[PDB]
Symmetry: D2
């Protein structure tokens, strides 16, 4: 079986609780997190985190997405930062146990319409192959359409994460989310635009609505602010990181903590440590039931397979859900049900591998082997790639159970199969 020690780790006594109150009462500081950290860390790259050597330390500390703030620097400066990130990422393309795809996100300066500088900076993003755009001061659905249009003919695969920074953005949230790929709760400007004591209501509301819609939500700004000058954060700061994860955030961000502060690597390490602890403390019993009850009935086989797979993973305490995905959509639909099992996404798309870091609990594996002549053989080779990487990284052991999600024919949009596999 698994043993009594297995059921004492990763807050499993608190997870089995019949009420939220009992769940809180059963939280144990001695119950150690075992699962890999599922909340992605976005680190803002600036003078303090630009060097190739510093970026290697940040990748090792847990950075998944590199943010380039186009409110500062120049095109030449950000292109050098992008090249340094790509160089530090590719320095691990040898050791499979260390290679990790890192997304590149462009944060716009902001706006009567889209600013001239935004148009130029967005074009720069397309030309430099950025994966994500954090669009500043989004107030309505037409602002997202303008950013979408500026991403031109070559950039329609770039993800647009709309930053909600003012009262109008909060009030028009539903129409913005409908046309955006995700949302960033941009607390800095939001805390100036609306009373500071109301920001938590906007954060909790937007995270809840994004979780319900199955779209990524980023919690941003001043999460570990004091770490710009101090080697350890305050009690309010560690609490804030933990509570953003407990709220349901897919990503957490570092701004000045990594862009200009004295402790960029330590700030990433701190976010990693807190997120792991907070993910184990999530009350999955009620969360899954509520995501289940609130999500409408679906006749989309990818959505139907995803809920079946997450239910199966919870039933056997599956070590992982291995999904084959071209666009990342199959992994995103698994992620919306918040499984405790890691979602190992095997893809041939280098861009999808970087973009799936926006989805909580998705661990991308970029597959570069040449295709098999028989499609079913090519599928099994990718499933075994996910198992062998999982074994290598520590996610899996022989005798573990995994859930495998695939489709019935090649190409995106046909996911409809869930298999229960025993690791051999």
């Amino acid at each position: 079986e698994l043993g009594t020690a297995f059921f004492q780790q990763q807050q499993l006594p608190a997870a089995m609780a019949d009420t939220f109150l009992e769940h809180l009462c059963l939280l144990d500081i001695d119950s150690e997190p075992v699962a890999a950290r599922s909340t992605s860390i976005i680190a803002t790259i600036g003078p303090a985190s630009r060097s190739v050597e510093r970026l290697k330390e940040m990748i090792k500390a847990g950075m998944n997405i590199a943010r380039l703030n186009f409110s500062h620097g120049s095109h030449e400066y950000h292109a050098e930062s992008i090249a340094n990130v790509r160089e530090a990422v590719e320095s691990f393309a040898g050791s499979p146990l260390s290679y990790r795809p890192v997304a590149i996100a462009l944060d716009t300066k902001g706006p009567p319409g889209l600013s001239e500088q935004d148009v130029r900076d967005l074009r720069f993003g397309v030309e430099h192959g950025v994966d994500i755009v954090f669009a500043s001061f989004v107030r309505k659905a037409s602002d997202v359409a303008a950013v979408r249009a500026a991403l031109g003919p070559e950039g329609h695969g770039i993800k647009i994460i709309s930053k909600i920074e003012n009262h109008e953005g909060v009030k028009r949230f539903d129409e913005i989310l409908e046309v955006s790929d995700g949302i960033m709760v941009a607390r800095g400007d939001l805390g100036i635009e609306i009373p500071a004591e109301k920001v938590f209501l906007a954060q909790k509301m937007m995270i809840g609505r994004c979780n319900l819609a199955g779209k990524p939500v980023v919690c941003a700004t001043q999460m570990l602010e004091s770490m710009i000058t101090k080697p350890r954060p305050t009690r309010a700061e560690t609490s804030d990181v933990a509570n953003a994860v407990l709220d349901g955030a897919d990503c957490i961000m570092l701004s000045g903590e990594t862009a200009k502060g004295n402790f960029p690597v330590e700030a990433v390490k701190m976010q990693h440590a807190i997120a792991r602890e907070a993910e184990a403390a999530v009350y999955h019993r009620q969360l899954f039931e509520e995501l289940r009850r609130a999500a409408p009935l679906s006749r989309d086989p990818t959505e139907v397979t995803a809920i079946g797979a997450v239910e199966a993973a919870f039933k056997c305490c599956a070590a992982a859900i291995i999904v084959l995905t071209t666009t990342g959509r199959s992994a995103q639909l698994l992620s919306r049900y918040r499984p405790r099992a890691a979602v190992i996404a095997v893809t041939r798309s280098a861009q999808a591998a970087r973009q799936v870091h926006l989805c909580r609990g998705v661990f991308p594996l970029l597959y570069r082997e040449p295709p098999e002549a028989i499609w079913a053989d090519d599928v099994d080779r990718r499933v075994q790639f996910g198992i062998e990487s999982g074994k290598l990284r520590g996610f899996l052991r022989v005798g573990d159970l995994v859930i495998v999600v695939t489709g019935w024919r090649p190409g995106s949009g046909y996911t409809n199969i869930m298999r229960v596999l025993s690791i051999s």
Copy 2:
């Protein structure tokens, strides 16, 4: 469509509380799904005619009960043959053929402590005549079940033993009896004499609840439509009783004198069929599925893990059916324990398993007769297609429906591990 959400008590099924669920029950909401609670009809003078048995199979009879408290071995062998003859008269159309189980109900131990000598003889008769199930009378402890198992010998290992709880000791030792039995029968006639009559409903509801929790079949028996022995229509208490046995969670409902000796055997089967369909639509699945899920323990068995994943997927898309390939019936039983609204269409080559799965609510057995294909994957698809074709013929499926298909990774029993979402074309 908007009309779809009007039928099969779907407004009452979406209710957030049990009280609102009751308030939304609609007499104009027609049941659409196939009747999932099995009907056991006791065979007798009123129901041994081969032509009368054909009418009863068409009316909904799933299990033929042979009461060994009456008649000789020669009488019961003629009952078995008349049953098999009426069942096999429909084998010429394999897409509409209905398997019918044969159950032997023992006389019991009487003033005796354990397996009576007559029961030893009757049980061996059952093995020799290939009965599918034994309804073991007056089971009081786990050792009574072991004695019935021993009397069936090495050749009767596949026969299902349903322990009849008919007295206080059986109720008090219920847990140990259920652990070693394949299922339970709430034998209300003797139970109502052995314990105060006003307490039988507590024993019925408790045993049904515990069997549902254990995932084992439970039969509600005796006097369900008693007045239909002489009258063409039942009383208000009788229709209520049938509906409430289904709402309690019974897998099977039974007819005794109503089919064995009465004047309305076909109409008593039609009546149970009509009530069960209405009551199944009125089940509050929202709470029931949540509770069965929360109470079911964690499992490392791939059949069990696939079953809950498949039931969850079926609810998510309002799947018309869950088509499962099964050798012993176990994969269909594990689907059935989560009480899906979707019909569990079980495709099997075992004629015995096809008969025995009638004990599990919502399992519709299809007997596959074709010899195996050389390529195993093609043999699985042909059986899946046979389920789709049978389901289309029988009204379970239409083009455009979504179905969940449950299969395994290699031949033989015990390897179910795959769930597929399929669109009917």
Copy 3:
């Protein structure tokens, strides 16, 4: 276990093995069913009232005394049979048997008298019904079971036929056809309660659908806080046989589990060979079924569904029921003029008996329509100080409770009273320790 540990040490483990208390503490309905125990005996008094149809088998004063002792709470007179002279003799015999026990509170049982109308037959109120309803007013009947109610205007016609003198009579509309089921909400709004008349309903709609109509109407009446009666063929075989069938005992238990305030006996008591035994059987089943009710979910659902209220009687009633559940109160003693304060307690389905102390003989008979209400008729002349008249009535309920099994030394009771005399001013809840 932690929420019942101190109370288990105080009241004892035997207290918590009775009245299905292990099944009542269950966290799910499934676990609640699994914990039902045939050895867990009912302790509480029977709360679902029994309506017995009075006919040739149950008319004698001596037979009626046996039926009152067996548990009959409401005597039904079916105006589809007999004559005015026949039913007046039945009424007089019921009143004579009821008053033969008027010697003390520790032995008095008030019994309501209900008139069941013949019906309209082939649209408006029939001329026979106008005559029969006038008979009911003249003979002081407490309730009218109005046959074949199809719309709100049918109820208004019955109310009009009762005249100015029959304003206090309760109108229980009988739902017997498809139109009455479809127009249920408008009928319930203007009626005092409902009767699920399963005999005609089972002929008017498919017999296999009657259970849906019964469960729906009971649920809606529970939600509205109005009495609902389950009627017809509950113990049918007991007309000739001394014991009922397994379906019949199941039906009675399920009507109580559904949420019915009253259960009825028709030919079972009017013409059968075992009228007293039929009443005893319904009494035995109802007590067992009341203990098996899953109060944990039921109370939560009645609370969540009941709208917010600014009526102090309504606010006091929910507070009193909550307090009674918290301490396992033996009773909730309420002072009432019309029965309304006791009815508002009853709508939350407390496990504690609602002992209603009233001076109104009619209200004492009519509160039998509400599940768990035990009426006590107070006969003493008023005290000079109103506060001391209130205290005397509360003590009358505590004295009847003490020597009637209900209350014991060391028991907690919840007492519900008002701030001024007259109907409509209930607003006080007190926790009292009995000594």
Copy 4:
């Protein structure tokens, strides 16, 4: 509607989060008490008057700093600023005085001296530092002597042993303080939130006050506005179920002590309206054990009645504060207005969330029933003056059958004016 009522009616916690509205303004009075540490920046009588008006309910004196002479001057200045508002008895705000001990280090003689100072100066609460076991609480209780029988002991959990022995400490303490500063050094900083949420949950279950403390608005020591993490932290302590929130250096030595109190007040009001009462009340009620105590039985009946009619307040007559504490444990949305003649109980009841103490200084009526009705009308008049009540509102009134402590057993539904 206002006070997050659309989010409060939600059928799931997820839908409740989705319905939270920045435009839905808080209407109810702030229920989470603010403890402000008094030091050089908040010592002056004039500064203390502005802090009382900003929302300070409990004045904390940290015996890790200063001297007995210094803290006695602080106590006198607090009492002077509090009494400057006693001319209007319908608006007078009681303020508790809490002594925070230095601690044991490697019961110390320093602590024995400081605890006797507290008894001699009439302190209402002792924040007992570094509590590791039930015997540490007994030692603090012994040092308070026979004259300090009524002082509330709030045990500070600041290390691994305190967390592990939490249950035995809570059973003998009056309440708990989650002392996050030392706890964040004694255990990994990323685990403190688990200890905070667990201790708050267990105290809510036990019906005992819990204080969230340290670095809640830390940046406000030098800056006029807090960080986004800080406002989030205050809101989350209230959402966790904390009865009190604390300010240390923010009020003791910082440049913006009044602004820090105003900030905690503003956040707490917003966070209290965002509490999901539908699930919280049902969980507190299901988990609270069955009781034969009439005060306990009346308290749940009164909270249930208050929710049923959206009562503006629950007015309770209490001697020791116990009847108000038993109402508070069910977390009613209605303000618990506690009318008390004891000045000590009025100060100590600030430890319980949603309890608003009213000190009774009117002459006693000759008839006891008349005396009770006047204390009840006093609650109504103070409520009307302070904005808690309006004509037409419904209030729940909780009283006893006989004078003296321990006889609460009555709940009445009253319509205002």
